[PDB]
Amino acid sequence: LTEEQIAEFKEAFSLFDKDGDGTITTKELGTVMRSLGQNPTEAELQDMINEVDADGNGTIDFPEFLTMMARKMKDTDSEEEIREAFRVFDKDGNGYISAAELRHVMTNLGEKLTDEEVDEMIREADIDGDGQVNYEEFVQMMT
Numbered sequence: 001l002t003e004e005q006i007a008e009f010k011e012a013f014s015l016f017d018k019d020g021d022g023t024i025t026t027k028e029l030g031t032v033m034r035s036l037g038q039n040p041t042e043a044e045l046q047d048m049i050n051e052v053d054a055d056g057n058g059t060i061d062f063p064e065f066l067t068m069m070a071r072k073m074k075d076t077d078s079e080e081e082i083r084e085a086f087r088v089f090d091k092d093g094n095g096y097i098s099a100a101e102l103r104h105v106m107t108n109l110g111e112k113l114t115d116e117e118v119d120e121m122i123r124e125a126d127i128d129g130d131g132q133v134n135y136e137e138f139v140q141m142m143t
């Protein structure tokens with residue numbers, strides 16, 4: 001969270017990433033674990049990576065290492081990032097994105113949409129039919 005903490009985690013990442021290619025492999029993670037007296041199996045090292053492996057490529061990049069350093073699972077971390085995006089649109093903070101809020105924030109992000117384009121976007125995302133898009137409907141719209 002803090003600028004100091006993140007700088008500490010970047011130091012740790014660079015240490016673990018011995019070849020400097022920007023990703024931590026099971027081999028690199030195993031070296032560290034064994035220097036700290038553990039004896040994880042190859043399967044257990046792979047599970048440690050899979051727990052934070054948001055993009056599914058089987059190695060840890062720095063954004064996923066931040067998840068690991070926060071001691072979180074990738075599902076918790078992804079939900080937090082989706083909610084950050086949701087709050088960009090939910091300007092009044094009431095937990096629902098209105099047509100006006102969607103039109104407004106989209107316009108200020110450079111996407112000029114017609115009023116009809118906006119109405120249909122809300123209608124498509126609005127599962128329960130209340131005329132607004134709540135968080136779980138937002139999650140579903142992004143699949």
Ligand SMILES: CC1(C)c2[nH]c3cc(Br)c(Cl)cc3c2C[C@@]23CN4CCC[C@]4(C[C@@H]12)C(=O)N3
Nearest residue numbers: 085089097102121122123125126133138141142
């Ligand atoms: C245009 C888009 C697909 C889109 N369509 C929407 C419909 C509704 Br109802 C609401 Cl509220 C918001 C959006 C957005 C905002 C989004 C979400 N996408 C996740 C990855 C890429 C992208 C694209 C974009 C993103 O960065 N912001």
Ligand SMILES: [Ca+2]
Nearest residue numbers: 017019021023
């Ligand atoms: Ca590496």
Ligand SMILES: [Ca+2]
Nearest residue numbers: 053055057059
């Ligand atoms: Ca990855």
Ligand SMILES: [Ca+2]
Nearest residue numbers: 090092094096
């Ligand atoms: Ca709102």
Ligand SMILES: [Ca+2]
Nearest residue numbers: 126128130132
């Ligand atoms: Ca709704």
Ligand SMILES: [Zn+2]
Nearest residue numbers: 063067077081
């Ligand atoms: Zn993340």
